[PDB]
């Protein structure tokens, strides 16, 4: 009905032209696109991506990477895993950096120059406000532009010799530094956020629409067990204890499923990010957005405290990577791939990124996408940054 | 009112001290501040050490309470507990007598699973429910008995070779194992709980009674700054950003202060525990209890992954100790003291407990109580358990 805020596409730094773009969206070939060696990114950052194995017509991942000027320079990398549409992810790929820039400008003069407030806390609050302000802008432009769906957001900035990794979703950032894995992010899923979700449904039961219960049970409760004792978990418990099933325990659980496929209100499997303002429950007028948050967790890495080698890297990747490769596998692939490349070859990290995507996507024969050890490959969109920390050395 | 009701229990010191009430009287001296230790004639489970000392004058009674016994689930469950009472001794006395019965009963619900979802998660759950049920019982009995004030609750059980440390308050548990400090709990303060507190006030603004705002500011906002930009911090923020000050920012902050002066609606400086069901904001009608919680955090230490020594101890203490002694000073004091008593001396850990209390309490000057390096001594009630992990070893 309404116009697109921006045309759909792939990251601008891939310099694709719209016929290249549609050769990319091949669900059976799944071509791995990489940054052309002729186009260098900040810090010679490597990038690689690939479309899902069928579940959405378009690659709903997006990514932006550039050097911001704050009136000081600020390096920037972003990944947005869109869902239920490409809209939010494209909008955030273009506009979040503007919000980050505006928030940093409020505080840039404190940075170059009664609760005591460290300067990092100002930078963190600028990122925190920037995510909040990117939402809101999506919220208010919903009714004028077709900004479909929702997206997670994972961004990194390098400001004054520190990395700030700010995550609101289930993408993941890790540093691989001389083989050790430094996690720079945590995921926001119905699993990791259960207590927050439960407590909010408890404090505001009208958000459940008399269709869900905020209590969590080992398996689905059917009227079969009404009046029997059963294990339950409330927002205040990490553990389990017994309760007599008392009618309302019959409703669909607010949190259901195990692990990576736990879902809030039978609908969404990630609890933070942007968009999803009008997202409702399957065939229902219950809104999901009260339960989601745009608020990112922000972690800091001081680049000045370590002399990083050619192989010490920050990996940014959407769940498409991490859904099949552990942190340890990614570290093993990185540390085994990069020593085979000339350390002064600017393409190194793109090829490392291509290696990671390859190892998560796999090869399609007749048994579906398989990676190493005959494991199912990832059928999701996969986007990978490989950021060489050697260019952040003081 | 509660003042018209009889006491649920008479005031006393921990039962296991076997103090006659002449001895109890002798112990509530605020000038000599006598350090009470466990009589060698009364052994505690695991030869557990215990020492305590009354506050320097800020309340007529020692408002700490402590309970130590071997419970039986119908299996054996060792139980140590500290309650830092406030605004009265009633909650802490009641909790020191009745929380164990809630624990026993919640454990009975899962005892058959234990000796025949991970099992730890069931023990954890029982503790979390027991705390909720010890509150609630206080909440109902409130109407028939004078269960004054509130208290924090730090408890430890040993069940089937694991220690569960359930903390709701600002007492602290640490293991000192071969000189290293293994933290077994986190305090629940207006600072550590800021975002929970702010978000609850955001969700339920009626809890502020139009006297408070949920936003935090680097200092108290003055009316003079209406319309100007100021750093603020909201519930979803760890950092600070700018905002224009808008009338509602002039209300008194929900969280204001730093360290132990940090307070919630200018009334309470600890945010978890039992009791306080009728606690109200300083001169007013705003109830504090909606922001309080009885839910402990539970941490597990597996007593089989390590063959513990004579000097490997779990230290439980109320903030009377941790307010003037850091974890490392406590570790310094344990590792310096315990090597100097016969390993087979059953009074070993009570003496270490006493030494900890004494190192926190200090000596009396014309200026007040001072510890080492002319530092100010603790003026609070101090209660310390030294629990020797050697008694938790395999087999
Ligand atoms: Mg997606
Ligand atoms: Mg994905
Ligand atoms: Mg007290
Ligand atoms: Mg105290």
Residue numbers in the entry:
A (entry chain B): 34 to 104, 142 to 183, 232 to 512
B (entry chain A): 31 to 104, 142 to 183, 235 to 513
The authors write:
Recent work has shown that the metal‐dependent protein phosphatase PPM1H counteracts LRRK2 by dephosphorylating Rabs. Cellular assays, crosslinking and 3‐D modelling suggest that the flap domain encodes the docking motif for phosphorylated Rabs.
WT and D288A variants of PPM1H (PPM1HWT‐LD, PPM1HDA‐LD) diffracted to 2.5 Å and 2.6 Å resolution, respectively. The active site cleft is formed by loops, including a short α‐helical loop (α4, residues 443–447), that connect β‐strands on one edge of the β‐sandwich.
